[PDB]
CSV table of C-alpha atoms and ligand atoms in Angstrom, one decimal:
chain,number,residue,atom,x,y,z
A,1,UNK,CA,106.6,82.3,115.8
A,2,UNK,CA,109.2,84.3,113.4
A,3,UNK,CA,112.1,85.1,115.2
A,4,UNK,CA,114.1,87.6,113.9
A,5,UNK,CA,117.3,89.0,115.1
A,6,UNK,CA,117.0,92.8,115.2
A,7,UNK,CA,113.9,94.8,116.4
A,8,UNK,CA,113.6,96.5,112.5
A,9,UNK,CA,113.5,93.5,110.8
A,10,UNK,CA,111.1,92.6,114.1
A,11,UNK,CA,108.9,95.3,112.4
A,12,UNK,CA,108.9,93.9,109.1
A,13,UNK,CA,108.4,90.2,110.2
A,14,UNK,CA,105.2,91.1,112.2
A,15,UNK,CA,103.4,93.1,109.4
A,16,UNK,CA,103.4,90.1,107.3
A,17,UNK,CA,102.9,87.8,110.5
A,18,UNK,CA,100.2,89.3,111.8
A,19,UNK,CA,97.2,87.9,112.9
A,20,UNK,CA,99.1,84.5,112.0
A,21,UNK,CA,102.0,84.2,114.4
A,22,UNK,CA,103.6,86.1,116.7
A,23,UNK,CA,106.9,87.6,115.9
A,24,UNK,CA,109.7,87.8,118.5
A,25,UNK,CA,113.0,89.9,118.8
A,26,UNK,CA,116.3,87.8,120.0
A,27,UNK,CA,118.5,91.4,120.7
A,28,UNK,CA,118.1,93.6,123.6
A,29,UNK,CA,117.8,97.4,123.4
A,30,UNK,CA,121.8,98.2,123.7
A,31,UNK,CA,123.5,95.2,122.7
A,32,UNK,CA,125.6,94.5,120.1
A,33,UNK,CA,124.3,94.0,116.6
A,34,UNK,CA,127.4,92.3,116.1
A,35,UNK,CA,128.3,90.7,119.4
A,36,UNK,CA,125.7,89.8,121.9
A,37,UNK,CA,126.2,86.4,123.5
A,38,UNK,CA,123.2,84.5,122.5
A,39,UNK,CA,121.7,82.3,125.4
A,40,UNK,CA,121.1,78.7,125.3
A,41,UNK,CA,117.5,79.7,125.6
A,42,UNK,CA,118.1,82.0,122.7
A,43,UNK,CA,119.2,79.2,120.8
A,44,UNK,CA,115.9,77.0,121.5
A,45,UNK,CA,113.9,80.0,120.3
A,46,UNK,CA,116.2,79.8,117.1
A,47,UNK,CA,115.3,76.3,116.5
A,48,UNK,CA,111.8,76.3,117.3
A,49,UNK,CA,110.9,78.9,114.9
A,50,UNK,CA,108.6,78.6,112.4
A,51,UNK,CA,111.2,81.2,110.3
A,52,UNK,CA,114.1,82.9,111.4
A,53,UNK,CA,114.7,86.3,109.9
A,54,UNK,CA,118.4,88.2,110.2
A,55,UNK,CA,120.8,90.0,108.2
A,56,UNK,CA,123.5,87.3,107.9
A,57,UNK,CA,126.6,86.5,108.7
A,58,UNK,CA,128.5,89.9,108.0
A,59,UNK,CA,126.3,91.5,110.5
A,60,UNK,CA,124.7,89.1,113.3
A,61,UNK,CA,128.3,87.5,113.6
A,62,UNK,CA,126.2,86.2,116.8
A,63,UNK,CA,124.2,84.0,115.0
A,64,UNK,CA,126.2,82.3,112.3
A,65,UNK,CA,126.8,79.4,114.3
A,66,UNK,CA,123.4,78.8,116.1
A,67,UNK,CA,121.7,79.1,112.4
A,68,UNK,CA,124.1,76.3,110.7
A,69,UNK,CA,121.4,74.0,111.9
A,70,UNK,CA,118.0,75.4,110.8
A,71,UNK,CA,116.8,74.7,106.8
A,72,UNK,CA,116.4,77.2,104.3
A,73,UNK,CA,112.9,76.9,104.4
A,74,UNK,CA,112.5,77.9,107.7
A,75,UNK,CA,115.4,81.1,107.2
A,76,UNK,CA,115.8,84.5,105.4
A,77,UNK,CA,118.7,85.1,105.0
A,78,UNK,CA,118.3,88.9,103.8
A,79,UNK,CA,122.4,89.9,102.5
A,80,UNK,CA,121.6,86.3,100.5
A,81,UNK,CA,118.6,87.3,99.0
A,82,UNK,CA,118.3,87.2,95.2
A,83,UNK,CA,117.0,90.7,94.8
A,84,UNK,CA,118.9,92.0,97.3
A,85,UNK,CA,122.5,91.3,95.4
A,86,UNK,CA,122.5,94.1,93.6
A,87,UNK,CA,121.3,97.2,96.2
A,88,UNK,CA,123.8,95.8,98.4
A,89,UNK,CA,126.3,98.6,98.8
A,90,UNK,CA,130.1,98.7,99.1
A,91,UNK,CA,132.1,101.6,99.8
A,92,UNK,CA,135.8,101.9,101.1
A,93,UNK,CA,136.6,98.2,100.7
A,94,UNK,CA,133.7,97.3,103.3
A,95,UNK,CA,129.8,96.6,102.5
A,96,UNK,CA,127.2,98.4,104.4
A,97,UNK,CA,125.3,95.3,105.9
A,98,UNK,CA,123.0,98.3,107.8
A,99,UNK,CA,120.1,96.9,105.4
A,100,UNK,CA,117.0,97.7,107.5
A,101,UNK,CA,117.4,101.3,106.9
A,102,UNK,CA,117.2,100.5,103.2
A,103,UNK,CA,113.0,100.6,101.8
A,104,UNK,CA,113.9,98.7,99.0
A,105,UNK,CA,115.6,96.2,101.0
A,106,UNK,CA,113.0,96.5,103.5
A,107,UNK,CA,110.1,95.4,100.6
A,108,UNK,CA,112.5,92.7,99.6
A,109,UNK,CA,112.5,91.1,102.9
A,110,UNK,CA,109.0,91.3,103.5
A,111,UNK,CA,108.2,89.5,99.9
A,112,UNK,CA,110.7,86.7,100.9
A,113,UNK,CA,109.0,86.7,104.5
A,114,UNK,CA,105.9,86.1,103.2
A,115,UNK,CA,107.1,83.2,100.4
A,116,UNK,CA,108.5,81.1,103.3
A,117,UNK,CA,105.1,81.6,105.2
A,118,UNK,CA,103.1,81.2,102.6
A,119,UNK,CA,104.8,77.4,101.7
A,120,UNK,CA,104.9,76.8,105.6
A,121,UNK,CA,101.3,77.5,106.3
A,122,UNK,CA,99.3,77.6,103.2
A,123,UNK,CA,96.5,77.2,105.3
A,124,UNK,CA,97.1,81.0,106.0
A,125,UNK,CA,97.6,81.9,102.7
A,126,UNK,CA,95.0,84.5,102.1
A,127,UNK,CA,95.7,86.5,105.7
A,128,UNK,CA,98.9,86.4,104.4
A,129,UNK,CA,98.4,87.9,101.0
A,130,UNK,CA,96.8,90.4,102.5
A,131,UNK,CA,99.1,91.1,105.0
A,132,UNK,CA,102.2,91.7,102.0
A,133,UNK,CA,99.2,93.6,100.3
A,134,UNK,CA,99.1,96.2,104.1
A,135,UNK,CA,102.7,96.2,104.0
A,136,UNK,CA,103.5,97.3,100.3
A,137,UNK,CA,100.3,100.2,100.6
A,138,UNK,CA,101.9,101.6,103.8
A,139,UNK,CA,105.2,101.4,102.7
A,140,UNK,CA,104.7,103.4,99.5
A,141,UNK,CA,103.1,105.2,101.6
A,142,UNK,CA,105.4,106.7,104.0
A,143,UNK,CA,108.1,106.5,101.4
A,144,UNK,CA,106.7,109.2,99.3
A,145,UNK,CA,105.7,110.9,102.9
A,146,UNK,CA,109.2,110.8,104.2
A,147,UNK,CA,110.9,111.6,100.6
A,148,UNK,CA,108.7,114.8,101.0
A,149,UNK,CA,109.7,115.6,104.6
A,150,UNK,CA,113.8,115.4,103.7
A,151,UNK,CA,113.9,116.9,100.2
A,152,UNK,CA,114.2,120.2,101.6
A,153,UNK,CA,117.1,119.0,103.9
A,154,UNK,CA,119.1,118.5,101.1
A,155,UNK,CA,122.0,120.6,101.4
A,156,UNK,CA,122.3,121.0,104.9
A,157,UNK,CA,125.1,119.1,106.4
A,158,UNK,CA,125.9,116.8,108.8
A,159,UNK,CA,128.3,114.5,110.7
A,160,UNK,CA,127.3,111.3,112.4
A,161,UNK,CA,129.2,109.3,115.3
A,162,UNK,CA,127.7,105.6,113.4
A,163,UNK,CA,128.1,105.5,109.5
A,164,UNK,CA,125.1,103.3,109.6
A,165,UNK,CA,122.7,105.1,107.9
A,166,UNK,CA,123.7,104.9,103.6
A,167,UNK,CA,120.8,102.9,102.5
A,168,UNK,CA,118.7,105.7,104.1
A,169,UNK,CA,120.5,108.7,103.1
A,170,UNK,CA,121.1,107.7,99.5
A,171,UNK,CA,117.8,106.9,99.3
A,172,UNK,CA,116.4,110.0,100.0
A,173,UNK,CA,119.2,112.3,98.8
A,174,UNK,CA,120.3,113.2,102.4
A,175,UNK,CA,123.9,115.2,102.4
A,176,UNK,CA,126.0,113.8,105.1
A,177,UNK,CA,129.4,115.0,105.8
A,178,UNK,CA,131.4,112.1,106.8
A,179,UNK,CA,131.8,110.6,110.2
A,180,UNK,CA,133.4,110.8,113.8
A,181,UNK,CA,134.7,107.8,115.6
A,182,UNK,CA,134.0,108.4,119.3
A,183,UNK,CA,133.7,106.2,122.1
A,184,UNK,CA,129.8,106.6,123.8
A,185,UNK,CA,131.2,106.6,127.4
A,186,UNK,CA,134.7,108.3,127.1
A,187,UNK,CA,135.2,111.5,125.1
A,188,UNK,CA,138.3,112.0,122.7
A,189,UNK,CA,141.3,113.2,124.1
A,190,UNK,CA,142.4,116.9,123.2
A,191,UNK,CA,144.1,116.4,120.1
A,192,UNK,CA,141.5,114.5,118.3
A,193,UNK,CA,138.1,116.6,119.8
A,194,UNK,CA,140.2,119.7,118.5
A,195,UNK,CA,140.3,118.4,114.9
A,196,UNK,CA,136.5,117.2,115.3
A,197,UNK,CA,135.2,121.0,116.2
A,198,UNK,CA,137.5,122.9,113.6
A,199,UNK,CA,136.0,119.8,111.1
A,200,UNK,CA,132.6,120.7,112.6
A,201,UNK,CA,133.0,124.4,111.7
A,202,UNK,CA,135.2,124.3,108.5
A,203,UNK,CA,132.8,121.9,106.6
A,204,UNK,CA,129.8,123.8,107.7
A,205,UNK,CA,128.2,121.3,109.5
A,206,UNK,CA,124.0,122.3,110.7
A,207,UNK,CA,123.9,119.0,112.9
A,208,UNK,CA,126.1,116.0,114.7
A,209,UNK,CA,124.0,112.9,115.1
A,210,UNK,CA,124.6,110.5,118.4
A,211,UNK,CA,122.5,107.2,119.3
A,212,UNK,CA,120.7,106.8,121.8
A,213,UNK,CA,124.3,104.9,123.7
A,214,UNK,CA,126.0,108.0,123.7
A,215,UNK,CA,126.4,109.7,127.0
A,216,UNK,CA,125.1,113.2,126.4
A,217,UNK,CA,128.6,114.6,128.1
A,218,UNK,CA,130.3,113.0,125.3
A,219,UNK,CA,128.1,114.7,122.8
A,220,UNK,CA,128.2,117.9,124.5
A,221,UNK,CA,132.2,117.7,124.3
A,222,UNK,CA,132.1,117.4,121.0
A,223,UNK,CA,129.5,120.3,120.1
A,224,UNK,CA,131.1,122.5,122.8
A,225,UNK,CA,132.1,126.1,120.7
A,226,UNK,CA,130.9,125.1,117.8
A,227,UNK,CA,127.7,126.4,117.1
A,228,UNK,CA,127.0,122.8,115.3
A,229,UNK,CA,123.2,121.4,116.9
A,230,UNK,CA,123.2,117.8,118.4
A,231,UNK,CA,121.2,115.3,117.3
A,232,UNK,CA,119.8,111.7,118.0
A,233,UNK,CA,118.9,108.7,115.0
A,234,UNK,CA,118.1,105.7,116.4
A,235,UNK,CA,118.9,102.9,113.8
A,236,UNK,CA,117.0,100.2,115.6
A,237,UNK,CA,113.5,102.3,116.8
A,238,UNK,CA,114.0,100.5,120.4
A,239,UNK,CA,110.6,102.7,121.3
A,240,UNK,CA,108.5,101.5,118.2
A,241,UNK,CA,106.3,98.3,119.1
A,242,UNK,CA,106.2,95.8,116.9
A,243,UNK,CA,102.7,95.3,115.1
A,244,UNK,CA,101.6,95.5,111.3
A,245,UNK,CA,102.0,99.7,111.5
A,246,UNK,CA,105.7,99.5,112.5
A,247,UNK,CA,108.1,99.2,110.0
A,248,UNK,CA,106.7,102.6,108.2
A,249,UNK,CA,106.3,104.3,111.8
A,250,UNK,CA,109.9,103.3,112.1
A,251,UNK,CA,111.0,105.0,108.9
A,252,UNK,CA,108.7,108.1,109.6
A,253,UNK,CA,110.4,108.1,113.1
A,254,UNK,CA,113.9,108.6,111.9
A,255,UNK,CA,112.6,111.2,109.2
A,256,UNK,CA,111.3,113.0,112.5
A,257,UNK,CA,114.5,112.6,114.3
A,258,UNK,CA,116.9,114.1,111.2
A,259,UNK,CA,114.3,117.0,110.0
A,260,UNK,CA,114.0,117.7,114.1
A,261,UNK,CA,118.2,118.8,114.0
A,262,UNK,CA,118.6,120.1,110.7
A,263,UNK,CA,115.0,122.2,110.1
A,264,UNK,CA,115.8,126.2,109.4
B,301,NA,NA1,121.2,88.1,92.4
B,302,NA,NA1,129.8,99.2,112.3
């Protein structure tokens, strides 16, 4: 099987795995992408892999250790990848590491997914072919889909809770704001929330974006008198399946749920 450590890059493994191995997720829906305790059983998974598939070590810190022992055939390693180097993106002092939001990215991985297969099981090589071949049509696809589905979003602002999303937005020339740290369970005191919804107002925000962790309480609190709409991304599609069709539904899902907030 490919293990991979996010359900995105889930989506992406199985379109080039499919009909060839299965593909399995190691993080629950909720967890941390950063700090999840990975289970012994988590670990044997790891190491029977035919190819493990994760960010690296900037982002699963969860897996850094367990992966130590697995060979470079057998990993992709996407934040190490060649042709990834250069669309990585730094900002602030800190590098987004967010990188299945990215297309680019996103075809990047898939090519080095299906190199690794393709020496691992050569036996498979034409399903495989054609599976990249599948994966490149439909993502071209929905890029161009998408891209044509946010261009007239351009202008309208926007704050978000997470600031996750870069590789998407400067991708497809989305106009965030900036971004609110707020805890999903308790909402800010009165100081802070004040500055938030005079923020809200003053900048001329259309939409504030929560994940699916937040309690809806906290969002209202924040949204309260203001007449800024409340929104929902999620970054890691926990309703999408995996299967070949995936990854593009994924991207077409999140086009959906920012075009949903900020349509007028
Ligand atoms: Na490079
Ligand atoms: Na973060």
């Amino acid at each position: 099987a490919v293990v991979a450590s996010l359900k995105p890059l889930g989506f992406i493994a199985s379109a080039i795995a499919d009909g060839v191995t299965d593909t399995q997720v190691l993080l629950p829906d909720g967890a941390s992408e950063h700090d999840y305790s990975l289970r012994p059983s988590d670990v044997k998974r790891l190491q029977g892999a035919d190819l493990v598939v994760w960010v690296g070590p900037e982002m699963e810190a969860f897996m850094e250790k367990s992966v130590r022992n697995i060979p470079d055939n057998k990993q992709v390693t996407i934040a190490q990848l060649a042709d990834v180097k250069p669309l990585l993106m730094k900002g602030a002092g800190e590098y987004n590491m967010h990188l299945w939001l990215s297309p680019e990215i996103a075809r990047a991985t898939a090519v080095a997914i299906h190199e690794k297969l393709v020496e691992l099981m050569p036996q498979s090589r034409a399903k495989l072919d054609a599976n990249l071949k599948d994966f490149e049509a439909q993502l071209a696809a929905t890029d161009k889909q998408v891209g044509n589905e946010l261009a007239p979003l351009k202008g309208k602002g926007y704050f978000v809770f997470h600031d996750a999303y870069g590789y998407y937005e400067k991708h497809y020339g989305l106009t965030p704001l900036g971004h609110f740290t707020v805890n999903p369970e308790i909402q800010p005191g009165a100081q802070r929330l004040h500055e938030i919804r005079t923020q809200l107002v003053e900048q001329k925000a259309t939409c504030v974006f929560a994940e699916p962790q937040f309690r809806p309480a906290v969002v209202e609190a924040v949204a309260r008198g203001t007449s800024v709409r409340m929104g929902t991304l999620d970054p890691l599609g926990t309703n999408i399946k995996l299967g070949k069709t995936s990854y593009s539904a994924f991207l077409s899902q999140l086009a959906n749920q920012y075009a949903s907030c900020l349509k007028g």
